[PDB]
Swiss-Prot record, chain B:
Stretches assigned to the SH2 domain: 8-105
Domain remark text: The SH2 and SH3 domains are important for the intramolecular and intermolecular interactions that regulate catalytic activity, localization, and substrate recruitment.
Protein name: Proto-oncogene tyrosine-protein kinase Src
Span within the parent record: 144 to 249 of 536
Family: Belongs to the protein kinase superfamily. Tyr protein kinase family. SRC subfamily.
Annotated disorder: SRC kinase activity has been shown to be increased in several tumor tissues and tumor cell lines such as colon carcinoma cells. Thrombocytopenia 6: A form of thrombocytopenia, a hematologic disorder defined by a decrease in the number of platelets in circulating blood, resulting in the potential for increased bleeding and decreased ability for clotting. THC6 is an autosomal dominant form. Affected individuals may also have bone abnormalities and an increased risk for myelofibrosis.
Protein source organism: Homo sapiens
Tissue: Expressed ubiquitously. Expressed in the skin (at protein level). Platelets, neurons and osteoclasts express 5-fold to 200-fold higher levels than most other tissues.
Length: 102, 106
């Protein structure tokens, strides 16, 4: 299955998996949302002055038609196409997606 | 020491890596490994391969806690003096697990 899809894990777990080792900014995973049923979460590491090393979480929603989106700028016919896209284009995410979470 | 050299212990491999190893189609369901938990310090994880046609091959991860007396448990039903003893038991009795432990992960 997708090496970046971690399934049903908690926000807190995703943060510990992502921060467990010294990973480049943009290390990520996709998981089910804890707080919104049917939705997913893209959890991405980042570093900045205000927060230091931190993890940002983006909700991915699923359209009734089947597609997925984080914003109105782009939507994707699959979840791997979303990931493939943001691996090359950050567009409003804190960083483009670089390493899959070890 | 001894735990390090056990065929069923995979040390510090990550949650994702354990699923990479266990989800290989060769492995019968009930193929397992024991590893450190990445998310609870001091805990271990029993990772077991499973299957159902409404989901395919998938992995169940059970936390193993160590009691400060020295024991290890997954549930209140049974506790164990060692991880070797825990594996031995669940190789005989599923008791709440998705499957009896059958094959040690290659």
């Amino acid at each position: 299955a997708e090496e970046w899809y971690f399934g049903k894990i908690t926000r807190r777990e995703s943060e510990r998996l992502l921060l467990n080792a010294e990973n480049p900014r943009g290390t990520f995973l996709v998981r089910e949302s804890e707080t919104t049923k049917g939705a997913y979460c893209l959890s991405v590491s980042d570093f900045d002055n205000a927060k230091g090393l931190n993890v940002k979480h983006y909700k991915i929603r699923k359209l009734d038609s089947g597609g997925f989106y984080i914003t109105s700028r782009t939507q994707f016919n699959s979840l791997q196409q979303l990931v493939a896209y943001y691996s090359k284009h950050a567009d409003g995410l804190c960083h483009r997606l670089t390493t899959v979470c070890p």
